[PDB]
Design a protein around this nucleic acid. Structure first.
Ligand SMILES: [Mn+2]
Ligand SMILES: [Mn+2]
Ligand SMILES: [Mn+2]
Ligand SMILES: [Mn+2]
Ligand SMILES: [Mn+2]
Ligand SMILES: [Mn+2]
Ligand SMILES: [Mn+2]
Ligand code: NA
Length: 327
DNA sequence: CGGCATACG
DNA sequence: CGTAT
DNA sequence: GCCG
């Protein structure tokens, strides 16, 4: 009834087991802070399974036969159903380790490895990092200066304003170039942590060298608070606000039109959906998938795709629109 | 037991 | 090392 | 942590 891969099942943005999935995702996050990518994946997959169910889980027996639910995840759900709370989850929530690793890793420019080292050095707060800025990278300094704004949800209202701005700069850098909204907002989210745009041009090859020209024009407009030949740009935009402005994370990506379907698919997510899709492609179909193409290692050939529908078909999967990829 | 997605900056 | 979905 |  429930397939084992998230790419084999529709997962809507809103669902009927929110509390249960949120608890499992706490344990997944904590596993990541401890370097256990395997446990993170299992908890993430178990959480996604509940997101895909057609109704709320009310009894433990309803977990029988569901993929990725073993002793541990079942016990988590058991306690939530019996007591409305799971002791392990609550112990994680209030642990100093979890709170600090979450605070640090959410800084733009700080990963698990950096946060862990800082935690081992005794650092605990953002001000602890601001006291010794000589140890920070320019990227981390930007993420720390703008941390407050970057922790505020981006609204879909903000997205429309940014896209018009980006299209203006793209139109001058290369007439005919297009801008496509991707990421969580393409999946239907009403809020997000950043805005993701995919840029291409209908004439293969014309997109070459495009991103530097876009960035130069955005910077000349005074809209870039931070940015690093290249095809991905992780920036911080100055977004006008009522009588002021706020910093917003924006990702700009360029792909040739031949690769656009694969880049659209990859950058539309979700992260778990794409991991599962690539795992499915390799393990079940023997094909190698990334945001550039789909490769048959036997014939040593790349699949030509004109649309996302093409890609799902070449993997033998039923098509899922972006709104059903919220794994 | 091995595997766990796959890139770019 | 960071970043992305 | 779970699947195959
Ligand atoms: Mn256990
Ligand atoms: Mn009990
Ligand atoms: Mn995003
Ligand atoms: Mn992004
Ligand atoms: Mn490339
Ligand atoms: Mn093992
Ligand atoms: Mn993300
Ligand atoms: Na970070």
């Amino acid at each position: 009834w429930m397939p084992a891969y998230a790419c084999q099942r529709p997962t809507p943005l809103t669902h009927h087991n929110t509390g249960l999935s949120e608890a499992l995702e706490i344990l997944a996050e904590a596993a990541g802070f401890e370097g256990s990518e395997g446990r993170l994946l299992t908890f993430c997959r178990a959480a996604s399974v509940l997101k895909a169910l057609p109704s709320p889980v009310t009894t433990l027996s309803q977990l029988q036969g569901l993929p990725h639910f073993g002793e541990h995840s079942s016990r988590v759900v058991q306690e939530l159903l019996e007591h409305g709370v799971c002791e392990e989850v609550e112990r994680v929530r209030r642990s100093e380790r979890y709170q600090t690793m979450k605070l640090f890793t959410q800084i733009f420019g700080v990963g698990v490895k950096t946060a862990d080292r800082w935690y081992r050095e005794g650092l605990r707060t953002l001000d602890d990092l601001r006291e010794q800025p000589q140890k920070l990278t320019q990227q981390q300094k930007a993420g720390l200066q703008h941390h407050q704004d970057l922790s505020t949800p981006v609204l879909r209202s903000d997205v429309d304003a940014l896209q018009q701005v980006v299209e203006e700069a793209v139109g001058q850098a290369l007439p005919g170039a297009t801008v496509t909204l991707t990421g969580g907002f393409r999946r239907g989210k009403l809020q997000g942590h950043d805005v993701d745009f995919l840029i291409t041009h209908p004439k293969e090859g014309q997109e070459a060298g495009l991103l530097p020209r876009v960035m130069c024009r955005l910077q000349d407009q005074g809209l870039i608070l931070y940015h690093q030949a290249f095809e991905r740009s992780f920036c911080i935009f100055r977004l006008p606000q009522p009588g002021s402005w706020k910093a917003v994370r924006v990702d700009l990506v360029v792909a040739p039109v031949s690769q656009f379907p694969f880049a659209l698919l990859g950058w539309t997510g979700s992260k778990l959906f794409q991991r599962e899709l690539r795992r499915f492609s390799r393990k079940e179909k023997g094909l190698w998938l990334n945001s550039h193409g789909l490769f048959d290692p036997e014939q040593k050939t790349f699949f030509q795709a004109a649309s996302e529908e093409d890609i799902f078909r070449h993997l033998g999967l039923e098509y899922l629109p972006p709104e059903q990829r919220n794994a």
